[PDB]
Design a protein around this ligand. Structure first.
Ligand SMILES: *[C@@H]1O[C@H](CO)[C@@H](O)[C@H](O)[C@H]1NC(C)=O
Ligand SMILES: *[C@@H]1O[C@H](CO)[C@@H](O)[C@H](O)[C@H]1NC(C)=O
Ligand SMILES: *[C@@H]1O[C@H](CO)[C@@H](O)[C@H](O)[C@H]1NC(C)=O
Ligand SMILES: *[C@@H]1O[C@H](CO)[C@@H](O)[C@H](O)[C@H]1NC(C)=O
Ligand SMILES: [Cl-]
Ligand SMILES: [Cl-]
Ligand SMILES: [Zn+2]
Lengths: 696, 4
């Protein structure tokens, strides 16, 4: 009766080893499905979180090591530069011998770092301008400080690019940290102690007199400046609706509305925008359209930067860039970083050098490392099987529209328009394997020296930023993938109306051609539904079938969506996370991902029921009293098995737009009538409550 | 995104 094939057994073993059958599925399904995993596994010293995703990403890093470390004579140019970059990164001897020499060479190009400079006012401060200072970091190194000017896809014309103006990403994980009291006092102290440590080492390098009280004063001033900038930034709750965010206006208007006075000299946006864009030979006039995402920030910024000199501002601007570079320097500089990462993430040790490097080259040469990965790990024939499952779930999503009692039939037709217009990107672009020319031409502008890691990373910062600003006048590439192939994740692009499933997630426990379809639908099936559902989530649902920010919702169907989805906002809002000192989840920040989980699992289950009706049942797995209907739900839960450090649990609640592992399982299965039926759970039990939140 |  039951299956007895190697791939059936591997499934059973993993399923049994992970689950704890001495717990009631109706009392706590997380502790039921993962209890076995929790008992055996402990968070590694280098990790802040650990689970199925983080184990697979660590298993993916091993595969990247194997290919990058060993050269081959048959390898093309694009590959050689990837492997050369890896060898340059892992050579500790070569890096350590330089010390902070590469940084001292670079500081002059970014108008120096005043705290670790002598007579700065005369050297730079004299002929210093807010435009050229912020523009250098932005244009040369891709570092956005005070003003975050970048070039991206236009929300109302998804084929066109346009200059965006937004608030900058802060030094600490979220604006919430800059209170610096209670749970944040630890991090804020370490952050300023990290500033001083790096400042001290640079002065020792330059042979200047170390005055401890002068370092402490100047760097607490940098903390004071960033506290004001942090307070001026809008909360994630006020950036949820993209219609209220998108505010297109010309540079002419921006100068009239959002004028600034930095170090006496009034700020010129025309001079500033050109200083950046002139790097790639493109002229900007006052009649240039600019999507301002943070108008309230710029308004609040005016009175902040009027009471701070060029010194105080360049101390922050230079520090914010140095902070990133520290990990590309000697062990002496990396020591000060690891101290700060203990307070923030809870990690007692530094990530293995070969793991940091494998990921760095994978991030700066996606297609090159993607080729090496899919050549080794990924099959290729599996791409056919996934394409079918996506088509099945896409149809199952449309089938559900007719059943929905809160959408008028005109909005249902417009929802089917987007649903059928969703493009699917599976595994990898076939270009990187077959077409060698295109791949070599991508990294042609890059020349790496094996004994010059810091010059290599600074080169990659130019190549990246240059590649982006180039696109301002270009029609967006429809063929260009958003993610590389060597990634354990899955994405949706609102701008392209595109679902993406890299080769990294097309593996157990999510998908395998051999393993039971129950597990496939429970794993990848839910993920496919999730990223489809992102097309119609709180942000997702404001974008048409061409990925344009246009309203296609009736004032009743829209009003209903809010009313219906407000359920999940309250549900997840009423979850106290023990690992984060019993703080409640931000139900508004997590809504988008929560909607996608609840929608995806439901869509995935129906797609499996359509498979049951069409293909009948399949041989059960050994050593398990669970039937095929349950193994679907068990596999879904085992996807999210894992635990967090308290230091990063705090970090997670404020930043992460995802709910933590345990509540993604509980939250959705509480809202699943099919789960309660499959596991025969009584009404009023914790995993089967009366009120059930539903959207898709 | 599914995870971070
Ligand atoms: C590391 O760099 C040093 C200094 O340039 C060089 O002598 C050595 O060959 C490199 N080591 C390896 C293992 O590549
Ligand atoms: C921070 O911003 C709020 C408004 O969001 C304002 O009331 C307050 O004065 C600002 N400064 C401080 C130090 O709280
Ligand atoms: C911006 O102003 C500065 C100072 O007057 C000037 O050197 C620079 O040429 C101007 N614009 C550009 C695009 O460089
Ligand atoms: C818990 O749910 C109740 C009822 O929906 C609601 O009044 C309350 O706001 C929720 N708690 C939160 C979001 O903290
Ligand atoms: Cl900043
Ligand atoms: Cl860091
Ligand atoms: Zn998602």
């Amino acid at each position: 009766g039951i299956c007895k094939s190697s791939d059936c057994i591997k499934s059973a073993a993993r399923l049994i080893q992970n689950m704890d059958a001495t717990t009631e599925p109706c009392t706590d399904f997380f502790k039921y499905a993962c209890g076995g995993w929790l008992k055996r596994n402990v968070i590694p010293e280098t990790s802040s979180r650990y689970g199925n995703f983080d184990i697979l990403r660590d298993e993916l890093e091993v595969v990247l090591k194997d290919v990058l470390q060993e050269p081959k004579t048959e390898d093309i140019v694009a590959v050689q530069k990837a492997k050369a970059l890896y060898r340059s990164c892992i050579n500790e001897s070569a890096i350590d011998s330089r010390g902070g020499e590469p940084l001292l060479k670079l500081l002059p190009d970014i108008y120096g770092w005043p705290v670790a400079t002598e007579n700065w006012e005369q050297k730079y401060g004299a002929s210093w301008t807010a435009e050229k200072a912020i523009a250098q970091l932005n244009s040369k190194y891709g570092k956005k400080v005070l003003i975050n000017l970048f070039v991206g896809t236009d929300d109302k014309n998804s084929v066109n690019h346009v200059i965006h103006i937004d608030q900058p990403r802060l030094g600490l994980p979220s604006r919430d940290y800059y209170e610096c009291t209670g749970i944040y006092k630890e991090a804020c102290t370490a952050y300023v102690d990290f500033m001083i440590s790096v400042a001290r080492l640079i002065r020792q390098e330059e042979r200047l007199p170390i005055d401890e009280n002068q370092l402490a004063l100047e760097m607490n001033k940098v903390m004071e400046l960033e506290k004001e900038i942090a307070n001026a930034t809008a909360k994630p709750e006020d950036r949820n609706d993209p219609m209220l965010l998108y505010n297109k206006m010309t540079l002419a208007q921006i100068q009239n509305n959002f004028s600034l006075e930095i170090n006496g000299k009034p700020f010129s946006w025309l001079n500033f925008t050109n200083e950046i864009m002139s790097t790639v030979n493109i002229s900007i006039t006052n009649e240039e359209d600019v999507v301002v995402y943070a108008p309230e920030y710029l308004t609040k910024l005016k009175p902040i930067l009027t009471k701070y000199s060029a010194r105080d501002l360049q101390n922050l601007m230079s520090w914010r860039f140095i902070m990133d570079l520290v990990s590309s320097l000697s062990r002496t500089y990396k020591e000060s970083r690891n101290a700060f990462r203990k307070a923030l993430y809870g990690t007692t040790s530094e990530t293995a050098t070969w793991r940091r490097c494998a990921n760095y080259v994978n991030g700066n040469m996606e297609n090159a490392v993607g080729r090496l990965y899919v050549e080794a790990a990924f099959a290729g024939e599996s791409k056919h099987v996934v394409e079918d499952l996506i088509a099945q779930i896409r149809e199952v999503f449309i089938q559900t529209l007719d059943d929905l009692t809160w959408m008028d039939a005109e909005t249902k037709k417009r929802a089917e328009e987007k649903a059928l217009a969703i493009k699917e990107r599976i595994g990898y672009p076939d270009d990187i394997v077959s077409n060698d020319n295109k791949l070599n031409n991508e990294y042609l502008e890059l020349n790496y020296k094996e004994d010059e890691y810091f010059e290599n990373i600074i080169q990659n910062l130019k190549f990246s930023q240059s590649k982006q600003l180039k696109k301002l006048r270009e029609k967006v590439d429809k063929d260009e993938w958003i993610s590389g192939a060597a990634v354990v994740n899955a994405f949706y692009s609102s701008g392209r109306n595109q679902i993406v499933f890299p080769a990294g997630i097309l593996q157990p426990p999510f998908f395998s051609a051999q393993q039971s379809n129950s597990l496939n639908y429970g794993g990848i099936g839910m993920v496919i539904g999730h990223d489809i559902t992102h097309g119609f989530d709180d942000n997702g649902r404001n974008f048409n079938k061409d990925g344009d920010l246009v309203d296609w919702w009736t004032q009743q169907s829209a009003s209903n969506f809010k009313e219906q989805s407000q359920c999940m906002v309250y549900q997840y809002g009423n979850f106290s996370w023990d690992l984060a000192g019993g703080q409640h989840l931000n139900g508004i920040n997590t809504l988008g991902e929560n909607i996608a989980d609840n929608g995806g699992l439901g869509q995935a289950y129906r797609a499996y029921q359509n498979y049951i009706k069409k293909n009948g049942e399949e041989k059960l797995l050994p050593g398990l009293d669970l039937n095929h209907k349950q193994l679907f739900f068990l596999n879904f839960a085992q996807v999210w098995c894992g635990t967090y450090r308290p230091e990063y649990a705090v970090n997670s609640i404020k930043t992460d737009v995802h709910s933590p592992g345990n509540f993604r399982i509980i939250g959705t299965l509480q809202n699943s009538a099919e789960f309660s039926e499959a596991f025969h759970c009584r009404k009023n039990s914790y995993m089967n409550p009366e009120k059930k939140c539903r959207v898709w | 995104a599914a995870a971070a």
